[PDB]
Amino acid sequence: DIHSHQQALDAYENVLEHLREKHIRITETRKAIISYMIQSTEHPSADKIYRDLQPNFPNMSLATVYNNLKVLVDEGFVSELKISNDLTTYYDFMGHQHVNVVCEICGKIADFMDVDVMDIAKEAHEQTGYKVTRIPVIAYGICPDCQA
């Protein structure tokens, strides 16, 4: 659903804002899972997430990973999927972000909600083998007032 935070926000800061708005608890474990999911090449299984994060989180169980994933799914920031003939569920961080457009004439700035930059990081990794670290984006255009 289309909305604004009156500023650009990356996927990570976006989720945290949305959760705070909904008065949802945000632990360090939850932040770590969110950050891992965002930065992830693949669509990791819960076990993958767990195995990669456990060493830095002593009180973490697999149950903790699944429980957090359920909340992120229910709040619409990750999606669950299965592939054919495979019993494991795979998780995909698909949370949106907010990016700026600048008027090339009057320099006025507006923001918009984006879900496509994620698919670019994936297309890049698939074709090139790079582990994608960041894809910083800003759009340029002509604001409605300058179109008139």
Add this chain to the structure above:
Amino acid sequence: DIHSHQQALDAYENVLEHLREKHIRITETRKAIISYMIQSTEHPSADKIYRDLQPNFPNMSLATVYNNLKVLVDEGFVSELKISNDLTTYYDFMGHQHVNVVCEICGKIADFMDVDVMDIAKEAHEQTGYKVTRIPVIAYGICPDCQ
């Protein structure tokens, strides 16, 4: 479909590269039509393109617009569409582009084929009303050799 021209190219630059590789002529009018199609915010008819471009092209007829659109359709950069209760053809630009990824450690550059930046432009227009002119995109990451 996935391929490289060994350089980043935007949607416009990409179409010209593709046409060149097939030794297809590229006139000023063909360039103007490619650009128009890329920057259109609604699916234009041939007459819309014609009426908008003709003042800069005394050479141009409606035929020239249709002929150029046909070439662009045949080369995979535009598609035709029909709507209910209208006999007129409308056109959609569907060409991809090529963007770089830069390795943060060693600086090696590779490129990949992209179709999503155009969707970003569309979302920006729909939500904000701005006419999008450009979205410079460069990806950064860790190249296979460095990892």
